[PDB]
Structures are given as C-alpha cells and as structure tokens.
Amino acid sequence: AIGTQYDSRKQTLPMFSFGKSTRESKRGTFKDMMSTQEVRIRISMPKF
C-alpha cells in the first residue's frame, strides 16, 4: 500500500515530477478577468 498495486478496486495515487520552465518563459495575454479591472470613466472634452 506504499507503492503500485494492480487492481481497479484500489487506485494508485499520482507521483508528481518537477518541470523545466524558466522564471521568464514568456506567455501572457488573456486579461479578461483580473483582480483590479483597471479604472475607466467617460469625461466630455471641451471645445478648445
């Protein structure tokens, strides 16, 4: 019970392994939902 067993009745828990992603491996976008939701308002401009 501390390893791998072969019977559908008793499952085998996963054993995770480390990845190889650098601290700055690009990727971004998809900002639809965000904590702040940057402020936007509507103010009429003068006629100059």
Partner: protein, 439 residues
C-alpha cells in the same frame, strides 16, 4: 494584443490616409470628436479599436498614426478641419519649404534635418505598442519630397526594427495619363532605392482607376476624392482579417510568406470588386460565380496591364460578408478550369483563401452601395513586367542628352547615381524574363 502603425509621406499619402481613416472610424464606431457616443455605452470591451487604436485610459482614442510631409498646406488643412480633435497635435510633423518635385532634393538636402524627428516619433509610438505586427506606408513616386522621405524612412526602418514585416502601397504613373513632366526620373530612382527593402507593394496607377470608375459607377465627372475612397476601401478589405471574427483567418504576417516566389520579385498588383453604385446595385441579385469571374476580369485590374499578356503565379484573395466555402470552391474550380486564364508550370496552386464575416461598411454620401458579399484580390502575375518595360524607355529617351540633369546634379547627388539605378532595373528586367520561362 495586435496592432499596426501607418507611416505616410507625400500629399497623396495624406489625402488617402484621410479617407482610409474616415472609413475605419465609421467601421469601428467612433465619432470624429474622439468621445464614445454617450447613447451607445459600449462599456467593457477590447479589440475593435485596439488593432488600430490605443486606449488612453479614459475618454478619447488616439489613432495610431503619424503624418509627415515637407509641404505645409495639407497639414494645416487637416489640423483645422473637422477631424482636428482626433489626432495628436504634435504627431503631425510638418516642414516649412517645399521639396518641389526634386527627388535629389528629397534625399540629401531638406530631409536629413527632419527624418530625425520622424524616427523619434515612430520609436516613441512603437515602444508603447506591445504586439507590433508591422507597418503600412503610403507614398507617391512622382513627387520628389514623397519619394525622398519614403526612401529615407524605409532605409532607416530596415536598420531600426529588424525583420518586422512591412507593406508598401506605392503609386506609379499611368501609361499615358501624366501629371508632371519629370516623373520618370524620380520613378526610376525610387524603384532602385525601394527594391531591396520593401517586402510587398501593390500598383495603384491612376488611369486604370479612372477607367473602372467611369465604367461601373456610371459617374462621368470623378475627382481625386473618389479614387481615395476606393483605395481606402481596398486597404480595409485587405486588413479586415485581423480584427473581426471569422471561420478562416489570415494575418498581415501571412502575406509576405505567401505571395513572394523569390526574394527579388516582390511586386504584385491587386483589384477590388464588386463596385456597384446604389442607383443600380440591387437590380442584380444581392451569382457568386459571376462575382468571382468579374474578380479576374481584365478591365477592373487596378493597375494598367493586361493579365492576358502574362502568366499567373500567385493569386491571394480575401472574402468578406456572407461568403461560404461552398461558393468559394464552386467558383474556384471554374476559374481554375478556365483556359483563357492560365497558370505557370511550377505553380500548381497559387490561391490563399481567407473567409471573413463582417460586411464592408457603406459610408453615406459616397458612391459605394450597400452589398452583402465582396471579393478583394492581391495577385503577383508575370504581366507585372510591362510597367517597368515602359518606364525604362521613358527614361533613356530623356537621358539621351542630359535633359534637366542640371538641377539634380546641383543638389548634391553624384553624377553616376542614375546609371546604377538603370543597371538594377535591367537586372530586374532580366529576372522576370528568366522566371517566366517554362522548363
């Protein structure tokens, strides 16, 4: 996170950018004053203007454009017009003294002291951009200031922003209709200078556009404004793929890799359709097969050359409206089967197809009529050699006895600058002959 920046030079450039901007603004839904209409209340949204506008945080929206010219009247008129509150006040760098149709003047005399401001502004506007795709340039050949400034801009951009894709919408003079008496010289010089830096350029010779306008719209007294409207619609059709939803997309980056058979031959010509005025548009059914057939028809090719006079090697066309792949392939099969339009031996398929939904917005007070389907095509065909063939003859005759050479020599250009350009054109002349010959 997709955007593009338009670099413009030359009075024709400014007056075409005007119309293209009214088209694009009316298409996204921004009034001229720059304030979103209080009734619409778009609210939380993205895209739309981003691909061509940058959020100011709140309120107005600055069109991501820069205007540069050496002549003051057009800039002053644009600033004082009804679009004053739209553009940045200081991004319209305008000079003082006219270049006066002297290409040499536009390249070494009164361009170096202002290209610096042009590049500084372009850099500042770019740094804020985070998803730069490429550039668009509109510049004339038959204008000295325009040609010189455009040459300088392209040369600097080749050294500032790397392999970023760039597109050039030049304008060449018609086979018989002319506006100046010194067009050929600046035409040849600009061709030489721009050959090895512009990836893509499409012909827009004026006489053909005159022909289409007369033939279809049935309007007998056109003016430069209508041609500008047609050109702006052409740009809109070309670029609509990047900002509206669609079942099949193509980007600006996916043009310079699909219509340039060789690194050297990168000149192609485009056409638009359908072009039917509202007075009679609806009598025909509003025949996708007939519309596609008209797309290839010799008369409406926006550049004065005979497609029948040359082979086809690359034909890229975009569809918008209620287009459907069923009609697309039904028409494509017939066009391909056609014999009168033949294809080069080593181009089994020269079709890149993109499908888009949003119909072309019809502007009030114009000639464009409401439609449901449109077809816009960008084609690089062996017939392109004709324009350069005619220009060469127009050049050697003049050069035979040093006509007008005095002012160009007196502007700092060395004597031999013309011969090298002629040699480059001849080498280009040889290439089209070589590529077009079957095995």
């Amino acid at each position: 996170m997709r955007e593009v920046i338009s670099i413009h030079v030359g009075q024709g450039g400014i007056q075409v950018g005007n119309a293209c901007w009214e088209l694009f603004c009316l298409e996204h839904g921004i009034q001229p004053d720059g304030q979103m209409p209080s009734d619409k209340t778009i609210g939380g949204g993205d895209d739309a203007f981003n691909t061509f506008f940058s959020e100011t945080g709140a309120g107005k929206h600055v069109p991501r454009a820069v205007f540069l010219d050496l002549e003051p009247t057009v800039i002053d008129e644009v600033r004082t017009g009804t679009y004053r509150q739209l553009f940045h006040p200081e991004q319209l760098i305008s000079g003082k003294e006219d270049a006066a149709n002297n290409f040499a003047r536009g390249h070494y005399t009164i361009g170096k002291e202002i290209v610096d401001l042009c590049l500084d502004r372009i850099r500042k506007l770019a740094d804020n951009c985070t998803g730069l795709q490429g550039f668009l340039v509109f510049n004339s050949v038959g204008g000295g200031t325009g040609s010189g400034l455009g040459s300088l801009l392209l040369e600097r951009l080749s050294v500032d922003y790397g392999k970023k894709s760039k597109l050039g919408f030049t304008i060449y003079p018609s086979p018989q209709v002319s506006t100046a008496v010194v067009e050929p010289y600046n035409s040849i010089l600009s061709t030489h200078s721009l050959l090895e830096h512009t990836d893509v350029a499409v012909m827009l010779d004026n006489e053909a556009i005159y022909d289409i306008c007369r033939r279809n719209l049935d309007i007998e007294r056109p003016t430069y404004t209508n041609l500008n409207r047609l050109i702006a619609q052409v740009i809109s059709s070309l670029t609509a793929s990047l900002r509206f939803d669609g079942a099949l997309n193509v980007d600006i980056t996916e043009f310079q890799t699909n219509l340039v058979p060789y690194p050297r031959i990168h000149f192609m010509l485009s056409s638009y359709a359908p072009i039917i005025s509202a007075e009679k548009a609806y009598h025909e059914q509003l025949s996708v097969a007939e519309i596609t057939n008209s797309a290839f028809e010799p008369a409406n090719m926006m550049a004065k050359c005979d497609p029948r006079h040359g082979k086809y090697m690359a034909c890229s066309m975009m569809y918008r409206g209620d287009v459907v792949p069923k009609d697309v392939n039904a028409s494509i099969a017939t066009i391909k089967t056609k014999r009168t339009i033949q294809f080069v031996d080593w181009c089994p398929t020269g079709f890149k197809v993109g499908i888009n939904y949003q119909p072309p917005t019809v502007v009030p007070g114009g000639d464009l009529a409401k439609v449901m389907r449109a077809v816009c095509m960008i084609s690089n065909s062996t017939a392109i050699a004709e324009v350069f063939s005619r220009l060469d003859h127009k050049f050697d005759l003049m050069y035979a006895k040093r006509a007008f050479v005095h002012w160009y020599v007196g502007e700092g250009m060395e004597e031999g600058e013309f011969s090298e350009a002629r040699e480059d054109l001849a080498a280009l002349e040889k290439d089209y002959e070589e590529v077009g010959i079957e095995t």
